[PDB]
Design a protein around this nucleic acid. Sequence first.
RNA 1: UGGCCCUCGAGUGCAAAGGCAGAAGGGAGCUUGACUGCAAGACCCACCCGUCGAGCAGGGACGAAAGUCGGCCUUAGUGA
RNA 2: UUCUGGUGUCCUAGGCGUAGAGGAACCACACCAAUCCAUCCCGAACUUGGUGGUUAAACUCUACUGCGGUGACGAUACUGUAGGGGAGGUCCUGCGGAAAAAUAGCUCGACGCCAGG
Lengths: 122, 135, 175, 72
Amino acid sequence: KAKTRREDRTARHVRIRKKVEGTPERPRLCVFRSNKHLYVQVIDDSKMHTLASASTMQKSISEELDYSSSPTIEVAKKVGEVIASACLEKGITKVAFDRGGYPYHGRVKALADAAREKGLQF
Amino acid sequence: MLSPKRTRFRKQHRGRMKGISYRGNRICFGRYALQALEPAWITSRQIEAGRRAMTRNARRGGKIWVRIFPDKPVTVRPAETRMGSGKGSPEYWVAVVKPGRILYEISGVAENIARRAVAIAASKMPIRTQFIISG
Amino acid sequence: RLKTNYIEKMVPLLKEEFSYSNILEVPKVVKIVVNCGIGDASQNAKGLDAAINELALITGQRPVKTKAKTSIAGFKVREGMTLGIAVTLRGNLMYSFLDRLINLALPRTRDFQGVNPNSFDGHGNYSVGFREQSVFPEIKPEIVGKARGMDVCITTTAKTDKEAYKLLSLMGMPF
Amino acid sequence: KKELHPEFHEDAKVYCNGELVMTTGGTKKEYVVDVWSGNHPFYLGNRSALMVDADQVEKFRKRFAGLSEIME
RNA sequence: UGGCCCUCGAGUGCAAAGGCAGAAGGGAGCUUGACUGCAAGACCCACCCGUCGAGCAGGGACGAAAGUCGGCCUUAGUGA
RNA sequence: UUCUGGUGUCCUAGGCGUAGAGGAACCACACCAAUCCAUCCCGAACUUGGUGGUUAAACUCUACUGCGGUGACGAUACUGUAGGGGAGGUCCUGCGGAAAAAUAGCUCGACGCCAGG
């Protein structure tokens, strides 16, 4: 009948912020959790490309229990550390804090903290 | 080029009849029609004296349609000097009748009866009128 | 009992009567808002507290404090005054409370017909109303202001209206 | 403190039936003829208007039909 | 009150234009830069005068953090 | 190559409506919830621990040209410069530029980094 415009979710959770835009794009940290696992990514800027991308499953390859729980907070810090380290070896710590939907202590509280264990400090 | 309106906060500037650009309608309602050649300030006492005359020679027949409407007010100075702007309702109100636009429309009748009907209606109009048909 | 009956008789018939498919996607209540408006116009805080401490018994949940929406009406009502409450239960607290009105409370009410008119909203939702003469195991006609009724709007996950009464009828709701 | 215990009343929640001995929970006439029942409102009788349309069907028999006086 | 259509056609302290739902809209907690001292580079005026402004120095508030704030959506609410 | 998730370069040829269809390898519903945390009322939404079932809805695709939108050629309006007419108060001519509406037609996007089948 009549076309209606509705601002999408990722357009009201206060995703994009000002200041950080001092650079064409701020080094955000994709710390989103699915409905079973959690995926982390240190997406770069400018146009695209990233430094290092890790997941809950990928960790299982290095050294982790097979049928081990993932949603557990214990895995959070594990997913935040696996993505780290190598990310720094790629050049230099270029990750910031970006997350809209997790009430501070969200399943990302350990993801951001894990970065403070490899070198990233703010 | 006027028709019964309704009360409102009507009271603005005069305006200015521009090029034929705007006006340029055609023949939609009614068989034949009638257009103008040069813009002007048509008052209400002209359209009414022309509409009734359009059916004055008919009486109980077809239907009359008006594809026009006045807007541009008309302020006139009483007799004194010029201290401010006019009222806007001393005499009446008008609009702009640029050429190319259609005015009166007649249908549901013969060609002759619909021909003489526009004749008298054209006499009531201060500006020259052009008679057309269709196509 | 009310929740259990759902997946052992309610859903089953909802699978044969309607289109045959999976198990879910069947009419299921999501919440029950038994709002109990208060006599507007009269500016009294007593009626407000007499309401919040009224439904907080039958539902065992602290009511709400709705505010008069900003608008220009005929009366001399202003914006910012509370004049109603609407509590909604979910999960076990929902099925349990819903089972009450079905089993108890009714036909406890003297002279209870049961014949309901058209109703329906137009999207798998149903609502009812109780006169100023109801009865609930929680309500106490010993220490209360005046006999007052309340509204009960029960919304489900039904897509159409024909899938609304089919969920409450086989459930136990008076029809 | 009345605001202390919000009163869950879980007992009445899960156990809605409880004991019908205390209060009648649908033991009376939920929807059935009470006693004698002598109510004749406008919705009864007047509603279901018993249609009464009788006519004369053609039969096979020799009988003279027609009144003494003829009239349209 | 519940569901559906829910599209600057609402709400912005007050006139009006523009702008705004990454919200200054609206609500809540903590608070209260409705900061001091300066300030590259410019706009607006004949002049006076008016306006905006990254960053720096000395100390704080909020958030995990990045980070914001030198008044109030802006333009009048004034006068050497 | 196909499919799926997060984030961009482009923002209604990329929108909306309708129909069909797919996945428990991925994503959503959904299960549970004494907790960290949230709901001025409900864990509906956030959030936390996780069998089963589903993937209806939502979302991601496909098909279908109702409703929007994108958009020629030609003509027309207007106009700079240099001139000529003229009773409606405008208009014409040489020359340069030349859209809006409308018509044929296009069209229901196309890609980039990374990860998981």
